[PDB]
Design an enzyme around this catalytic site. Structure first.
Site, PDB file in Angstrom:
ATOM      1  N   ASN B 190       1.079  -1.162  -0.289  1.00  0.00           N
ATOM      2  CA  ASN B 190      -0.146   0.069   0.164  1.00  0.00           C
ATOM      3  C   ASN B 190       1.137   1.259  -0.413  1.00  0.00           C
ATOM      4  O   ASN B 190       0.361   1.864   0.206  1.00  0.00           O
ATOM      5  CB  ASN B 190      -0.468   0.280   0.714  1.00  0.00           C
ATOM      6  CG  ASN B 190      -1.642  -0.984   1.649  1.00  0.00           C
ATOM      7  OD1 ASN B 190      -1.305  -2.216   2.801  1.00  0.00           O
ATOM      8  ND2 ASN B 190      -2.012  -1.653   0.505  1.00  0.00           N
ATOM      9  N   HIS B 192       2.853   1.879   2.436  1.00  0.00           N
ATOM     10  CA  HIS B 192       3.011   2.760   3.837  1.00  0.00           C
ATOM     11  C   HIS B 192       4.102   2.065   4.672  1.00  0.00           C
ATOM     12  O   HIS B 192       4.706   0.728   3.778  1.00  0.00           O
ATOM     13  CB  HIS B 192       1.660   2.061   4.534  1.00  0.00           C
ATOM     14  CG  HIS B 192       0.509   2.937   4.430  1.00  0.00           C
ATOM     15  ND1 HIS B 192      -0.442   3.561   5.189  1.00  0.00           N
ATOM     16  CD2 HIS B 192      -0.275   2.746   3.058  1.00  0.00           C
ATOM     17  CE1 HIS B 192      -0.910   4.618   3.959  1.00  0.00           C
ATOM     18  NE2 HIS B 192      -1.085   3.603   3.239  1.00  0.00           N
ATOM     19  N   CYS B 227       5.013   7.079   9.349  1.00  0.00           N
ATOM     20  CA  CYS B 227       6.257   8.042   9.133  1.00  0.00           C
ATOM     21  C   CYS B 227       5.349   7.820   7.363  1.00  0.00           C
ATOM     22  O   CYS B 227       5.377   6.756   6.946  1.00  0.00           O
ATOM     23  CB  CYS B 227       7.501   7.434   9.441  1.00  0.00           C
ATOM     24  SG  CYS B 227       8.513   8.488   8.053  1.00  0.00           S
TER      25      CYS B 227
END
Ligand SMILES: CN[C@@H]1CCN(c2ccccc2F)C1=O
Ligand SMILES: CN[C@@H]1CCN(c2ccccc2F)C1=O
Lengths: 269, 268
Positions: B190, B192, B227
């Protein structure tokens, strides 16, 4: 995994893991490179060589001699999807006093089709002085019995990409990723930066738009010097080109000393 | 891997790989964390949940709702050696409207002894607004049938390490690793940052001499904020003591907290 019937090559199957895939839900080129390394290490263990990535004998360990990668060339036709089983076959061949070559063939376990191939050139070096040396007859004789004697090439073709000369990228680079540093996960069991980390660092300077709209088909990487655990690296890329091609350079952030150079070829999705 | 006989837990075996081990020739805590994630993902796939790390149903997907880790707690007694087969059992349990808990037990495949254990707390959140939701009723009913109903805890002891409150490290930190940035290998499907990357970043500020003379026994990590791919992080560590450390990961610019945690190390 296991050595094949004639004992001159090694095969192993791997199930692609959830954390091993990228945005396409298929294995990244770094997952592929780690798997090639794993099957190489399992082949060395199977016939009694050291398993630390240096494939040494008792003779080499006494002399403080190791095998080091000089070039890695990988070509992928289809990246395996998450949960797919990929079968990899590997073998080694001596190339006289120059060094050795390790080849790999990747196949889809369900269909049996070749989904990728790789070749790598290895040279012998003193671990402490970093001085290269040609292979002696006594060292050569220790591994010749584990290699096929007739040529067996993953890249047989006449003007194949795996043997192409790579030029040095000139400043200014079109793209760059600056201040890359290795963390503990980037080190191997010997506290050395893993060769796969350099592949990731090369790819860091490719613009995200290329990555989002293209698939990596071929990567050729020359290894000139190793990055220490406390070194800082700059990754530089310039477009050389339906297909996109790039020239790459990894150099130490301070003095600009070359650590690697390479080329990538990407195809539109 | 496979669901167990009663269908309320999942087991899988893994052979420790050459690149998965550290300078001790045993699996790193990040290899362990990746394996816990892998067996969790395989358990979700086995019963029809999404496999992207968010364990969603068709109902959650329509509402843009996801499960996110709030806390990870791992305790290792023996790190498996390279080439060893480690067997991992995992299960999930609802904790009312608070969220869910996923537990794991690690065992040596040859001896059958428990070599480690982990527990994690998960909360529901809107993917876009990042706002927490106190679970639902229709969402709960979708996963209760895949969880044991009687309590089954990897850390049963009252007032154990897994539930301890973690304080905020005060400046100046005794040690630090500054300017840490994630690369593409640190991202998931994704785009991430993988939760395991934060474990590696926490450990980066531990001095090399501690790592060379000690083994990590326990790590507890709270997750406050994610983050982004273009964020830069500073990892801070202070000795609180066996050796014990307090940790803080914060964005390099404004100092915004992303994670906090504790580690406990044993002399080799
Ligand atoms: C790196 N090149 C070395 C040379 C010896 N070697 C090798 C040869 C045959 C079987 C197993 C082996 F490990 C390598 O892989
Ligand atoms: C993150 N927690 C979720 C909540 C539902 N869930 C789950 C429960 C039972 C079997 C498989 C599952 F994926 C989780 O793992």
């Amino acid at each position: 995994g296991s050595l094949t019937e004639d004992g001159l090559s090694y095969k192993e199957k791997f199930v692609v893991r959830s954390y091993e895939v990228g945005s396409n839900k298929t294995a990244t080129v770094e997952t592929i490179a780690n798997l090639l390394q794993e099957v190489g290490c399992n082949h060395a263990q199977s016939v009694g060589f050291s398993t630390d990535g240096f494939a040494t004998t008792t003779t080499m360990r006494k002399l403080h001699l190791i095998w080091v990668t000089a070039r890695m060339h990988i070509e992928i036709y289809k990246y395996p999807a998450w949960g797919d089983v990929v079968e990899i076959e590997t073998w080694c061949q001596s190339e006289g006093r120059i060094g050795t070559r390790r080849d790999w063939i990747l196949k889809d376990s369900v269909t049996g089709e070749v989904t990728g191939r790789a070749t790598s050139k290895w040279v012998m070096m003193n671990q402490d002085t970093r001085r290269l040396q040609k292979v002696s007859d006594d060292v050569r004789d220790e591994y010749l019995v584990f290699c096929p004697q007739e040529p067996r090439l993953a890249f047989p073709e006449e003007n194949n990409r795996s043997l192409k000369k790579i030029p040095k990228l000139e400043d200014p680079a079109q793209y760059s990723m600056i201040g890359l540093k290795p963390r503990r996960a980037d080190l191997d069991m010997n506290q050395h930066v893993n060769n796969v980390t350099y592949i990731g660092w090369v790819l860091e300077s490719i613009p995200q738009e290329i990555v989002d709209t293209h698939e990596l088909q071929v990567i050729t990487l020359d290894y000139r010097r190793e990055c220490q655990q406390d070194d800082v690296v700059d990754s530089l890329t310039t477009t050389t080109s339906n297909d996109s091609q790039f020239l790459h350079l990894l150099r130490l952030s301070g003095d600009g000393q070359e650590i690697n150079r390479g080329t990538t070829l990407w195809r539109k999705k």
